[PDB]
């Protein structure tokens, strides 16, 4: 774990075991850990994409780390998906663990599928970012974003470093997940990975431009004209 140092507003990285006499550390308050979002690199943030970057393994314990500051997220997820047999696919969050508090669009996902045993670990080993903490696994019903953690040494300086989209999973990861976008409990639109969080809201706004929720069992799934 290298420590970056910001010097003259320039990021340089110091060797861990070097006698770097240019680095002056008068207080532990100069040492910070920062959680960064996987948005910075342009990676797609839609639901199928997120599902495809997650997976499972049993026999490996979860790990948790703390952080001081982080990036604002445009997108985050809240997963509470049940197993096909009715049990949960995910563990309970530990006491003191709360979801990520700084997100514009959360993709809340439920529904069902044939979830394997083990923990829901990130495919590239990225951490799930939670409220001032991060961990290697996904917890049930807890909001999180995906990210990485950098460690910095700061000079003395003063830098200081919403809506819900509801989706329903179907067979969760077995080749494809037949996700539906929920408009109401009866009205669904089959999800297609072209629709951004903004398009989904705009589509929802249009649907209720001349409408409202009513009552019972229509259970109709709509497709978008591909044009």
């Amino acid at each position: 774990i290298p420590l970056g140092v910001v010097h003259n507003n320039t990021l340089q990285v110091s060797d861990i075991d070097k006698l770097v006499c240019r680095d002056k550390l008068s207080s532990t308050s100069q040492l910070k850990s920062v959680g960064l979002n996987l948005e910075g690199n342009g990676v797609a943030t839609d639901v199928p994409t997120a599902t495809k970057r997650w997976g499972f393994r049993a026999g490996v314990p979860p790990k948790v780390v703390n952080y001081e500051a982080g990036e604002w997220a445009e997108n985050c997820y809240n997963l509470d998906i049940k197993k096909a047999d009715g049990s949960e696919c995910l563990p309970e969050a530990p006491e003191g663990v709360r979801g990520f508090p700084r997100c514009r669009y959360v993709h809340k996902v439920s529904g069902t599928g044939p979830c394997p045993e083990g923990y829901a670990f990130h495919k590239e080993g990225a951490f799930f970012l939670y409220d001032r903490l991060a961990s290697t696994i996904i917890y049930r019903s807890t909001t999180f974003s995906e990210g990485v953690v950098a460690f910095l040494i700061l000079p003395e300086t003063k830098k200081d470093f919403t809506v819900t989209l509801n989706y329903v999973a179907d067979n969760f990861g077995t080749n494809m997940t037949n996700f539906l976008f929920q408009v109401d409990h009866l009205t669904y639109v089959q999800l297609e990975p072209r629709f951004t969080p903004q398009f989904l809201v705009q589509l929802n706004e249009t649907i209720y431009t001349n409408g409202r929720r009513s009552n019972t069992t229509g259970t109709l799934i709509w497709k978008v004209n591909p044009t």
Partner: peptide
Amino acid sequence: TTELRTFSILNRKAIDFLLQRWGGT
């Protein structure tokens, strides 16, 4: 903080005490 049961205060103070005497220089 996120520490649930705090044990770090006295040690943290010792660390800063030493850094004040030697803040890397």
